[PDB]
Design a protein around this ligand. Sequence first.
Ligand SMILES: Nc1nc2c(ncn2[C@@H]2O[C@H](COP(=O)(O)OP(=O)(O)OP(=O)(O)O)[C@@H](O)[C@H]2O)c(=O)[nH]1
Ligand SMILES: Nc1nc2c(ncn2[C@@H]2O[C@H](COP(=O)(O)OP(=O)(O)OP(=O)(O)O)[C@@H](O)[C@H]2O)c(=O)[nH]1
Ligand SMILES: Nc1nc2c(ncn2[C@@H]2O[C@H](COP(=O)(O)OP(=O)(O)O)[C@@H](O)[C@H]2O)c(=O)[nH]1
Ligand SMILES: Nc1nc2c(ncn2[C@@H]2O[C@H](COP(=O)(O)OP(=O)(O)O)[C@@H](O)[C@H]2O)c(=O)[nH]1
Ligand SMILES: [Mg+2]
Ligand SMILES: [Mg+2]
Lengths: 431, 431, 439, 439, 12, 12
Amino acid sequence: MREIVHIQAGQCGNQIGAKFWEVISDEHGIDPTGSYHGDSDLQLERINVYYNEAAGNKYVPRAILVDLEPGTMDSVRSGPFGQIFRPDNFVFGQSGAGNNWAKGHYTEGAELVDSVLDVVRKESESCDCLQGFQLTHSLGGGTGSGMGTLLISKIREEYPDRIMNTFSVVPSPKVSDTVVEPYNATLSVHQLVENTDETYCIDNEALYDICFRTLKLTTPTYGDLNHLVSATMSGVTTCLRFPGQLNADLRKLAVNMVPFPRLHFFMPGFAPLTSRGSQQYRALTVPELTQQMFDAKNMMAACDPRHGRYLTVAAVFRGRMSMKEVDEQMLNVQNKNSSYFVEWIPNNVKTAVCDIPPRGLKMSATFIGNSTAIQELFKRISEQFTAMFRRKAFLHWYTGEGMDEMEFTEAESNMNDLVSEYQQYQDATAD
Amino acid sequence: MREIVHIQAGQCGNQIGAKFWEVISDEHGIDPTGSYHGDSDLQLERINVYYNEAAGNKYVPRAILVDLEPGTMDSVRSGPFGQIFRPDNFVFGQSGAGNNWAKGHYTEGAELVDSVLDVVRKESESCDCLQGFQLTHSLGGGTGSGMGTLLISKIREEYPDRIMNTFSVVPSPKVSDTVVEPYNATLSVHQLVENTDETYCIDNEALYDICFRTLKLTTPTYGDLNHLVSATMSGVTTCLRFPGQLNADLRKLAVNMVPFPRLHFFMPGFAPLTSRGSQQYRALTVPELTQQMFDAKNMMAACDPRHGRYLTVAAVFRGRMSMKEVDEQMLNVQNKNSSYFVEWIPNNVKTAVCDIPPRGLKMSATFIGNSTAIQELFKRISEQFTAMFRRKAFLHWYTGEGMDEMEFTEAESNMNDLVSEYQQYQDATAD
Amino acid sequence: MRECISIHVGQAGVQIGNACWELYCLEHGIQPDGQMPSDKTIGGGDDSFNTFFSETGAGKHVPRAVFVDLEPTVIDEVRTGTYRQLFHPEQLITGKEDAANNYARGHYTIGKEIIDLVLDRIRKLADQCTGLQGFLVFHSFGGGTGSGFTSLLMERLSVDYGKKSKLEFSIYPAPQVSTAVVEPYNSILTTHTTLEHSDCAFMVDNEAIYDICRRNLDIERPTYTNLNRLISQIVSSITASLRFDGALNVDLTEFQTNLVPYPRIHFPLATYAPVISAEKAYHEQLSVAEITNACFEPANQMVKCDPRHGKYMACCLLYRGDVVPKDVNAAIATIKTKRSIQFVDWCPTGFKVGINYQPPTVVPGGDLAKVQRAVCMLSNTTAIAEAWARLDHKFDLMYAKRAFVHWYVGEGMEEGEFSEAREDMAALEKDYEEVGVDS
Amino acid sequence: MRECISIHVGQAGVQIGNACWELYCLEHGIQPDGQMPSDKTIGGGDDSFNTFFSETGAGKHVPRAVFVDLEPTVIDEVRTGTYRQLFHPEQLITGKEDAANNYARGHYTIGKEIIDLVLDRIRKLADQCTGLQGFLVFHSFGGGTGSGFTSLLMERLSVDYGKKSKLEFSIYPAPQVSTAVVEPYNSILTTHTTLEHSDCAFMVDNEAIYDICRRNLDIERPTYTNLNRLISQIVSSITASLRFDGALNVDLTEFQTNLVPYPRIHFPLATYAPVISAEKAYHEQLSVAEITNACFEPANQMVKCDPRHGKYMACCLLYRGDVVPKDVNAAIATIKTKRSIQFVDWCPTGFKVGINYQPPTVVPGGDLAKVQRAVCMLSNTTAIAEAWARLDHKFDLMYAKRAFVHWYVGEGMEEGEFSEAREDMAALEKDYEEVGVDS
Amino acid sequence: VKSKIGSTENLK
Amino acid sequence: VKSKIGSTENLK
Ligand SMILES: Nc1nc2c(ncn2[C@@H]2O[C@H](COP(=O)(O)OP(=O)(O)OP(=O)(O)O)[C@@H](O)[C@H]2O)c(=O)[nH]1
Ligand SMILES: Nc1nc2c(ncn2[C@@H]2O[C@H](COP(=O)(O)OP(=O)(O)OP(=O)(O)O)[C@@H](O)[C@H]2O)c(=O)[nH]1
Ligand SMILES: Nc1nc2c(ncn2[C@@H]2O[C@H](COP(=O)(O)OP(=O)(O)O)[C@@H](O)[C@H]2O)c(=O)[nH]1
Ligand SMILES: Nc1nc2c(ncn2[C@@H]2O[C@H](COP(=O)(O)OP(=O)(O)O)[C@@H](O)[C@H]2O)c(=O)[nH]1
Ligand SMILES: [Mg+2]
Ligand SMILES: [Mg+2]
């Protein structure tokens, strides 16, 4: 019924989406060949949310892979679960963006966007009732940032009422993996704040902090980070696929989480997360899930939520639970820690409970927080962008692709307006 | 009952007809020796549409092979299924046209046309109820163009009410395989527009585009192109040979497809067409056949139908199908894409459904579109012919065979009149 | 005693006839080869199925039907199928070339070649009857044979017999779904030529039956077979009063008497209820009132039109099976009370009632559920004026450009016949407008 | 003879309906597939459960219920669960997209797509009734469908039927526990729009039932199933007078007559007693007086409010089982004597009494103990003014900043409707203040 | 165009 | 804001 078109863009985003499809196919009992070998009847009851049936009991993921270089495409094709994707959906150029937003947004992505949109339209025509779109990409890259923003603009133009969800990997506060990361991030945010319904802020540095501090991993690979991001992704759209005591689709989350049209950048989280050894010392109760969810050191975005206030909070639980216990924990958190929630919104937390827990767990819960502490991320990116743009650092690389400097000025102005709005709404007396 | 006399002319046309007879003998279960070794009873129920019985359970195809050089005749005799043709029907001269329309139409073809017509009359006398004639040839060649046009004129004179169908290979928009292709094409069209009931525009360049883009063939040979053309041919006359829920012979298609006597040049198509690997990712439903049929990149004529309007459309389906599904898809295509159909014709699409799918398929469908976008082909040919005739380029080669220059002027005038008519009917307000 | 001759013209007619004769053989217990396992009496008796089946030889029942087609494909499907031994070998009449969706061909060019053969077969069948009531002609408007040859045969039968009732079961051109590009031409020409030579033409629509199969029968993908079986159920409900005795019998003449107020308005819409799948049959109490109310639902009409846009001029309700007449009385009174069901002021008595004893017969492998009772409604309403106006608009759009006109002119059609048919269709639209005016 | 149609809108409505219909099938002995093991009489009789179950086919009872939802998840849980063969397949109505906790969506954008289908189903059910008394609409305030579509359906039913009683069982937004962030908006809009189109809306609260399960049932961790089963017990106590005979019967109209003093004050609070576990059932003498006194305990109210903060305007005590009316008389006199239970001065006769013979039925695998008698109290008190003021304060806090307002404005909502609803809610608060003044 | 049925010929 | 029910219309 309610179907989601997943779009992969860039190395940082498509590389996640591969792990995401691994996890999703594991949840629904679909082996790396597309054949169904599950046990529970509920696995195929809502299988069409992500999977088209391919006339012979093979299920094909409704996914579209976009990049400007075929290397990541070959890597995805050769790896595990690379044989379930439809070969027609691997749309890729030959040049590559080179971490240049202007390039990937105006020349190479502009040449490839027509084929990408043809594939998107073909996937949307095959749907029963299109719920929305799902994009995975990074903000500080090339293909990812520019190509994803271009695709979001195009699709928002074509489908104005569908849901546009993006899981964006944001720049890290300490270590940057791209020398021009501020420009790409600022331009990508300027494009995102105008077209997306909700966007999730994944920060790699926070993911390494979680892997070392909580999971006690000494050698964490990108498999683990992509697995955490994919667990978040699966927890988001769980209510669309399995029944539960309280259902909450993407639109319900968007309504309950976005108070004003521009404040839609969320801090995702996940629980439970334990090391391999500490499993035998932790009982799994709803209070434990609640304690780990509302934890600053558990956020996947490198922004301390204790430095701001929560506008809205989504808490999607999974597994057999008591509604009284979940409601009790939410209310106790709101009452005991009232100094961290926005005053002019009563009942800040949205609650959803599903019946089917993730693979191997008795129960879990996905945290989605809309906190004003994301102004830290935005202000840091704005200050770095100003420091680099004042000297025109590497500005010629973007002006040589036909991009205007006034466009950079407008993007900086929009970023600062978003920062000022986030600051305006926190610490605003409800009187 | 209803019988068709197939006539082969030229290398480009007879070379198709060989593959066509291979496919037809495969459909009816007739081995390369003429013996019947089929399974279903329906294969022999309408076997006399193409096959004469030869007194001993050997079936001979009602085909006539015409050329001005015996090389292609020897190639057809030596290849597979070359032993099923009757040796009396290989009519060939010794000289060859040399890609000269004037030669093949006025001297060599004029010397051979008497024997060809004797064979045609002998084949027509043996019939029960002659439905019509079927010619396969090219427009930019020698024997093909001139000989086929001469034969069409002669047969239209002798049989004025029978159906004259020709499957013509038209010049390509980018690469020409003959330096004098514009002259031959223009003269052949001048002859065709006056005598044929319907003619199909096959363009090689579009066939390579289909083979590479859709079938994902890296080394496509003329076997594959002739096989696509033969699949179209077989899909056209399927209703005359096997039963179905909706029957549509050649005359029904001619009535429903040709609104005005001169606008009878069609753009054939075929579905489904998949690569060898992408078969496991595509479910075969009537909506899928409809989506692939009404696709500009699927047309076998190198003319984009999105640059014009559809006067009439024929959609002959094959295999077990639901009539509701086919009608629903046709109506949805007409409603959602109404800007591409002619306003002054309601219900632009003719529907026919047969029960027996092609060999190896669960179901298929042949597209026959009468679009005003063929004016692109005609205008390009006219402009090339004007550019070459203004300088009298290679005009002596045709005037030395007794041909008049005023005849070239008349042919150009008729071509431009056809272009102007096609332009007149599209974008003509139905008010 | 009372005989009825069915004539099946064109592919649609022949396929609907296959369905109808399968249903007849199922209802009367006749084996596919004409034999009867309970054949206790041979050479006479009653055996009320003598209306459609003639006793020949010794213990063989042959249908009183003539199958006419211009191409041998469909009739050859019949000649080699399940009922190859049921029909008389000379009742299956074929030409050699089709009409190609061309009214001109099937009426002048090709129809003249077999019209005499068809009429001679019909005469041979009619001479074997003692109480021949009328003919049943099954065909489609937008076709070839089923339009041109149908009109030619209607003219010839009106000349030969005259006072025998001439009922038609016609596939009305759907407003959106279509098969041929030139359906408006054939439909307008057929309506003009066969108007004054027909007594009552029952209207059905493939698009409306598609919608009924989707909504009610819960069949997402029906073929032409399901449509043919539903139409066969309608035909059986119409002829059951002849084939079975009941509490209130209605012969074929009563239909033309009660449903045709004016000689030029004889297009009643077919409607059948209940049409439900076997799954939801266990959850519904299919009482007389429920079915009588469902018959007037705009979503259950066999023709894609809105009865709320017009008024009812004459309505016929044919009940079958476990039906109590008091309940019919009460349900029809309730229907008359409803203000959403509008009747013309000049027809204060708007219903005609028929009640039979034979319940509907389930075709093995069929779609409809086994029910205790069913109602077939044959309503003559002014709502069909909208469909006629739609056909007229399509005809005008196609004819203003002279598109496809040469295909008919070159087959013996004079171009003035198009204009004459269009003028007559405008006159018919004005007739429908005039009858709908309260005064 | 007397029929009642239940309508279950939204996820909460559908789940409470699952509970209620399980309890009904248990009380009347109906198997999950509609069959009855003691089905001695088929096609009529009494069998008083004809109020909620219709006799169809031959020996099958179908509930007189319509399940409405905008997403297929909950209704598909129903369609593949234990009672998949109990409901009519067309009574389970679904859209394709949810309302997303948005009143605007479920009222204008999405509700308009299936409101006609729901009303046609309701009409088909009502036409099968001879003594239809009224409708039971189960929903929740702070939801989507269960608020917007509930209000739309209430308006349409008030237009279509008018004089039939329209009772509602609504999940009132809890003062502390909540699910959605925008519950105040939906609650205020629903209350404003459905106020003048409802006869009596019974109030229950998830937080109060949480507290009752913790204190009384000794259940530390109850799920939504326990809450649904307790609400189902309340519904059964309300409808038992229709479904069973007793010493003092009370039909549905008497509730709206006795509990609604003014047209705008029709929010009586539900209360049920005794609610005890099986462990402590052996240590208590559950007499009539004990249960009557427990009904007025502030800790046993199904709505999180303090009845001591207001006055009672009308009270209805529905007894079931081994109940002697003299004891009811004495217990109600004792209640009237207590000064801590304050009634308004303008209502000297404050109680309405109903006594049934059928004792409460224990659901197998349930929570409540098997008791000989139980009392369901439906009290209309001015204490709900505090809850209305709390909802108004939350609405003002959220609306002063225009938070979430665009989500409704972009769905067809005009921004002035918020202000109109808020003004009407202030007027309702003033109504509650005025009725509580002794004079 | 005029109608052809005489529905109003004797409207008395 | 004013009340809407007429509880005091005939307080006599
Ligand atoms: N209900 C129903 N309609 C049919 C069936 N077969 C064909 N039709 C309708 O018939 C119309 C076309 O006319 P045909 O009967 O097929 O043509 P024809 O009578 O054989 O005349 P020709 O053109 O000479 O072939 C289409 O609109 C179809 O909807 C059928 O089996 N059931
Ligand atoms: N007592 C009880 N309350 C429930 C139950 N299920 C949901 N609720 C309440 O319903 C409220 C939310 O409204 P829902 O009914 O879930 O939403 P909806 O009616 O489906 O409308 P949508 O927003 O479109 O999904 C919450 O406050 C819950 O407390 C239940 O099973 N029992
Ligand atoms: N979490 C995660 N982050 C990644 C991965 N690969 C790259 N990144 C991040 O993405 C950024 C590089 O952008 P990238 O997407 O590779 O450039 P692009 O291909 O041109 O869009 C760096 O900051 C990396 O930290 C991955 O597999 N997982
Ligand atoms: N599709 C197809 N086209 C061909 C084939 N052989 C030749 N042609 C085309 O026919 C044209 C040459 O004309 P040709 O028929 O060989 O000259 P002719 O023998 O004198 O009539 C060229 O444009 C070729 O592309 C073939 O086997 N298949
Ligand atoms: Mg035909
Ligand atoms: Mg819901």
